[PDB]
Design an enzyme around this catalytic site. Structure first.
Site, PDB file in Angstrom:
ATOM      1  N   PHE A  46       0.883  -1.192   0.000  1.00 30.27           N
ATOM      2  CA  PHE A  46       0.000   0.000   0.000  1.00 30.27           C
ATOM      3  C   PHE A  46       0.909   1.227   0.000  1.00 30.27           C
ATOM      4  O   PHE A  46       1.576   1.494   1.011  1.00 30.27           O
ATOM      5  CB  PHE A  46      -0.987  -0.102   1.162  1.00 30.27           C
ATOM      6  CG  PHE A  46      -1.611  -1.474   1.239  1.00 30.27           C
ATOM      7  CD1 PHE A  46      -2.375  -1.957   0.186  1.00 30.27           C
ATOM      8  CD2 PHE A  46      -1.367  -2.320   2.314  1.00 30.27           C
ATOM      9  CE1 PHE A  46      -2.925  -3.229   0.225  1.00 30.27           C
ATOM     10  CE2 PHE A  46      -1.915  -3.597   2.351  1.00 30.27           C
ATOM     11  CZ  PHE A  46      -2.690  -4.052   1.306  1.00 30.27           C
ATOM     12  N   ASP A  86       5.217 -12.110   2.445  1.00 35.33           N
ATOM     13  CA  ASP A  86       6.147 -11.640   1.375  1.00 35.33           C
ATOM     14  C   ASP A  86       7.587 -11.568   1.899  1.00 35.33           C
ATOM     15  O   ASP A  86       8.291 -10.541   1.637  1.00 35.33           O
ATOM     16  CB  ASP A  86       5.733 -10.297   0.770  1.00 35.33           C
ATOM     17  CG  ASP A  86       6.466  -9.959  -0.529  1.00 35.33           C
ATOM     18  OD1 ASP A  86       7.149 -10.856  -1.092  1.00 35.33           O
ATOM     19  OD2 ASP A  86       6.371  -8.796  -0.963  1.00 35.33           O
TER      20      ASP A  86
END
Ligand SMILES: CCNC(=O)c1ccc(Nc2cc(-c3c(F)cccc3Cl)nc3c2C(=O)N=C3)nc1
EC number: 2.7.10.2
Length: 278
Positions: free
Chosen positions: A19, A126
């Site tokens: 984001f 991730d």
């Protein structure tokens, strides 16, 4: 805890997390000042989650949270974190010939931080070289918790809706959209592969996996990747990677999740392997 827009002057962008942008600011209340990394919102649900997660986490191998700057421009908070100018191992390793012992100290440090993250019942989702920052020559910190989730269960049910790093992902993640603690260990194995290739682009997971699959049918890269992994094929042994390390890498890449070591398992193995090549 609250930083003021008044004394927060932008210097440059550092990059794009999950984001929105990560940017360098000088925070100079004196107007003559502490230098800070500020992650911003450009989604709104997942962004609120990264703030609440990193605000809970405190560890020597997790990027330091500092505060939240009430950003009037996006009707939300910006995440303010410590600045580490050496950047990611993906940025640093291609331009610095780091020795084998140092790479294994980095790998030990990642496992300590991930062991801590698991203990706090969170998955990363991730764990990649691009999300591991270098504070100095022998200290790494995990950043980008944009995809991190609270496990309620032994796994989180992810979606297809999302920027999934499929080349760092275990078969169970790719096929059954379940993300286990053991899925982050598989990602660690790939990260460890990146470290021992000095994050060389030509040696990268996406390069090497698309070299095995090809580009002729892009609508089934995942299906082909899933099959390749279930047939037991793996990223190769990096040049000058010791047989013992590659075996640990392959142990992280076990098709069955329950046969992968936890991070608490890896720590003393990496401690001991580090000592040997030192
Ligand atoms: C191309 C040269 N690269 C740099 O010059 C450099 C130096 C420091 C740097 N720092 C980052 C980078 C990130 C970051 C990002 F921008 C994108 C994806 C993942 C991460 Cl972890 N996050 C934080 C920081 C930081 O200091 N505090 C938090 N970023 C870039």
């Amino acid at each position: 805890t609250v930083f003021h827009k008044r004394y927060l002057k932008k210097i440059r962008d550092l990059g794009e997390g999950h984001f929105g942008k990560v940017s360098l600011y000088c925070y100079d209340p004196t107007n003559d000042g502490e230098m800070v990394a500020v992650k911003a919102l450009k989604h709104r649900s997942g962004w609120k989650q990264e703030i609440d997660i990193l605000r809970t986490l405190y560890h020597e191998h997790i990027i330091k949270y500092k505060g939240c700057c009430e950003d009037q421009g996006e009707k939300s908070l910006q995440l303010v974190m410590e600045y580490v100018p050496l950047g990611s191992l993906r940025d640093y390793l291609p331009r610095h010939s780091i020795g084998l012992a140092q790479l294994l100290l980095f790998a030990q440090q990642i496992c300590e931080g991930m062991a801590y993250l698991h203990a706090q019942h969170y998955i990363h989702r991730d764990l990649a070289a691009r999300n591991v920052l270098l504070d100095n020559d022998r200290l790494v910190k995990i950043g980008d918790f944009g995809l991190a989730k609270a496990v309620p269960h032994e796994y989180y049910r992810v979606r297809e809706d999302g920027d999934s790093p499929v080349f760092w992902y275990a078969p169970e993640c790719l096929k059954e959209y379940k993300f286990y603690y053991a899925s982050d260990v598989w990602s660690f194995g790939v990260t460890l592969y990146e470290l021992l290739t000095h994050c060389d682009s030509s040696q990268s997971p996406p390069t090497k996996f698309l070299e095995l699959i090809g580009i002729a049918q892009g609508q089934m890269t995942v299906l082909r990747l899933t099959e390749l992994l279930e047939r037991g094929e793996r990223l190769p042994r990096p040049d000058k990677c010791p047989c013992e390390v590659y075996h640990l890498m392959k142990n992280c890449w076990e098709t069955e999740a329950s046969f992968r070591p936890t991070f608490e398992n890896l720590i003393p193995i990496l401690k001991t392997v580090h000592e040997k090549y030192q």
